[PDB]
Design an enzyme around this catalytic site. Structure first.
Site, PDB file in Angstrom:
ATOM      1  CD  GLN E  15      -1.462 -11.644   0.213  1.00 50.49           C
ATOM      2  OE1 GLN E  15      -1.518 -12.965   0.622  1.00 50.49           O
ATOM      3  NE2 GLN E  15      -1.181 -10.592   1.221  1.00 50.49           N
ATOM      4  CE  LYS E  37       7.403  -8.853   5.891  1.00 51.11           C
ATOM      5  NZ  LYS E  37       7.717  -8.714   7.290  1.00 51.11           N
ATOM      6  CG  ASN E  38       2.066 -12.561   0.331  1.00 48.15           C
ATOM      7  OD1 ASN E  38       1.400 -12.435  -0.862  1.00 48.15           O
ATOM      8  ND2 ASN E  38       3.422 -13.009  -0.633  1.00 48.15           N
ATOM      9  CG  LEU E  39       2.138  -7.078   4.394  1.00 49.56           C
ATOM     10  CD1 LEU E  39       1.915  -5.988   4.993  1.00 49.56           C
ATOM     11  CD2 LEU E  39       3.653  -7.243   4.853  1.00 49.56           C
TER      12      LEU E  39
ATOM     13  CG  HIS J  83       1.925 -16.075  -0.878  1.00 46.82           C
ATOM     14  ND1 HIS J  83       3.156 -15.881  -2.170  1.00 46.82           N
ATOM     15  CD2 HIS J  83       3.378 -16.550   0.213  1.00 46.82           C
ATOM     16  CE1 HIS J  83       3.657 -15.753  -2.161  1.00 46.82           C
ATOM     17  NE2 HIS J  83       5.147 -16.291  -1.026  1.00 46.82           N
TER      18      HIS J  83
END
Lengths: 91, 91, 91, 91, 91, 91, 91, 91, 91, 91, 91, 91
Positions: E15, E37-39, J83
């Protein structure tokens, strides 16, 4: 995570040869943000923000990295920029 | 700064396999403008505008450049296009 | 999940009577993508992509589906395009 | 008001000289809609939709109107187009 | 052409290091659609749709493909997604 | 008026068959707002906000309304959403 | 094509019940342009432009056509506006 | 097909009087690209790219062409700009 | 600078004949902001904001400036507007 | 500058009462980036990235800063988010 | 969650002094939707939709809330608006 | 209504702490236009346009007004800027 901005002045045959697009693309692959700006004297001003390591990677790419442009010089300038730029825009 | 436009007809397994995007990306790294248009017969029509050297660079990439699409033939067609295309759009 | 594209030529009084809009709306309800393109001879070229069963549904609607336009004829022509269009737009 | 479309094929030094922008501008000033399209052979295809009186005025402008381009010939072709284009685009 | 979707869960330093952008760009060169998608736990969830061969090609890239990010593991998860995504988005 | 939000889970062959588009279209004709999200397991999550009479009407459409999709089951799950969504988007 | 514009004042329970969207949708399927504006007194102003035959068709739909709204009255007013609206907007 | 960029500094009552808009419009009719920039000292910086004959035409217009602004002097300054701007924007 | 707003009512055959576009263009060349609105009785409402001299300039063009429309009357009505509009829109 | 992200789960009367817009506004004044997502259970998930001091300021504002919402609890969750979020969006 | 709309007529020195922006900002902080419209007579028409408590809260702010504009009177007018306005627009 | 433009050079810890966002927001509540620009030396350049009374009000806010940033000095610079900026941008 650490964050700092650096300014690069790039000179040579660097305009109209896809340099701004390629630099923008390269910077985004490094998780960097900033801009590549065409100067009136035919130079390209590159500002990039992120960790010092990724900036060092970009600086090295500006010099050696495979590209269409003919880079003659890349001068690292002192910068006090702490602004968050969105993406890597061509100016 | 000389600018001309060349048309390329690319045939093979070249649609829906990322060829239009990749061609667009490569052309922009070269400082070229134009479009990659999907034809009804399965071919992709590439129009690129810039200096002859950069156009030869794209023409060579269309043939041998590492890509996902399986290119069988790249045909160079005559063009009298002198329109300033913005970016490298997929059509 | 097999996907293909089909080209349809619709003739009659089919321009300026809401046919292109209604067609694209019908196509999007069928989970299809493509375009409706107005031709110089008064015809409308409809390209749609999806499963064959859905494309059969669209053809049937083009012929006798409740609409404003007066369709004298619908003809399906050959197509080898495997490009993925976004939505269903009017041309 | 009655409304019809007309197709014009403009030949000569008409690309990259602000002709499509000027045509669209002149078209919109006449309350017309349609497009100006750059053809591969160097010609420009002009489609315009409005009153017959205004189309005639555009026809005359394409032939004699003060412009940067040097028009060789303006051929008027028949059209069955009854589609409503938004504004006057350049393609 | 066949279409299926696959879910991927990438862990490690992924990330803020251009991984989502690079992955997206990589998928588009393969003719793939979906998202990165960033978790909250630091991982990145990659969904990609296309032909099985292309998805395998992306899966291989996630593991050993040259990238800024340092990937620990690439877990492949089952998916019943049949939705058509536009491009390859970053979330 | 007194608005509330209801969450619906729809199962079956409901992805990639125009269900999300049609649902949003139907909801907008009812004066509803919300979204249709595609889930990993193949289900579609529908969230709609409005007066209870409209929500019941939408529920019945999700079940029996003429559509392309093959609906196995519609389940109204609990929701405490009081946020005002704009239009009816697809996710 | 002959183009006329008509003005409709629709009264009753016609706001916040999907009427403007449905009217817009119905107008576009008829090949009409114009707008549907929500008035302070609860009424809805509908302006539509196209052929007289299509206007009569919309006038009928506003009166009888199946919709969510409870139409009380539809007064057709005289209109001299001959402006080309783009699409069918909600105001 | 020979392109270059020229830089013009326009002084006088040239800001807030439609000069930037008019310049861009004029430049676009000449098939030129670039920008009109407002400077802090009241001057307007105009950059235009195209063939020299067109840049000559623009310079002459900046001086004598019918306009709202009151131009006192126009100076072409040096430029080594080889970047391709899109359209003719105001800054 | 000293800025005020004026309202103009233009009567005659002034709709669907490019008057609103041309008026907008003319106003922007005068450094003016505001709008051109099409009225139901066939009239066009022109609101422009700027210095009085430019507003006098616009009024004179509305009357006898070379245009497509047939203006039989231009009336200046009172206005106490002090709002800053962006550009010159068509309503 | 050092940068980190924190997740806040806000519960109470917090949806449809301007909380997401105000949290977004407040975060942007602190130079923070992230989002405010409305959760199905009536909670609002706030993610904010920046310097630890700015985050503490936002955390304090969430708890007792003047707002329309009735905040009952603000829970600070652990987050490995790194992010780059653009702006402060509402989800 | 009930919802009604209210119209406010604000008179005074209320145009071109940031009143429309500030009102929009304040209403969005209250969870309201609607618009602030500049009237030709110098007044600003404010329509807001939401719960009576929030509408009373905005009504009070228009009168006493710290602002740049010099509000002389705020007339509360009857309204039958039930349309879902998106955001708080400046008209 | 009179309007002029002023330039401000703000120094201190003013970048990446919401100063540009807050300033632009404050200017818009005052009914001002212009921009807030991040300079390489760490300073922020603020250009605002409007009535002299409001410009002083913003000037005072830059000095004393509650904000995240730590302002060392606010140097007011002369300006002949008469261009109409739209909104209040961050650069």
């Amino acid at each position: 995570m650490e964050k700092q901005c650096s300014k690069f002045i790039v000179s040579g045959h660097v305009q109209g040869v896809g340099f701004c697009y390629h630099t923008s693309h390269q910077g985004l692959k490094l998780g960097l943000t900033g801009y590549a700006k065409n100067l009136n004297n035919g130079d390209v001003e590159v500002v990039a923000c992120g960790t010092p390591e990724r900036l060092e990677e970009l600086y090295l790419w500006l010099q050696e990295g495979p590209k269409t442009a003919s880079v003659r010089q890349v001068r690292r300038l002192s910068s006090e920029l702490e602004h968050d730029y969105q993406g890597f825009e061509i100016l």
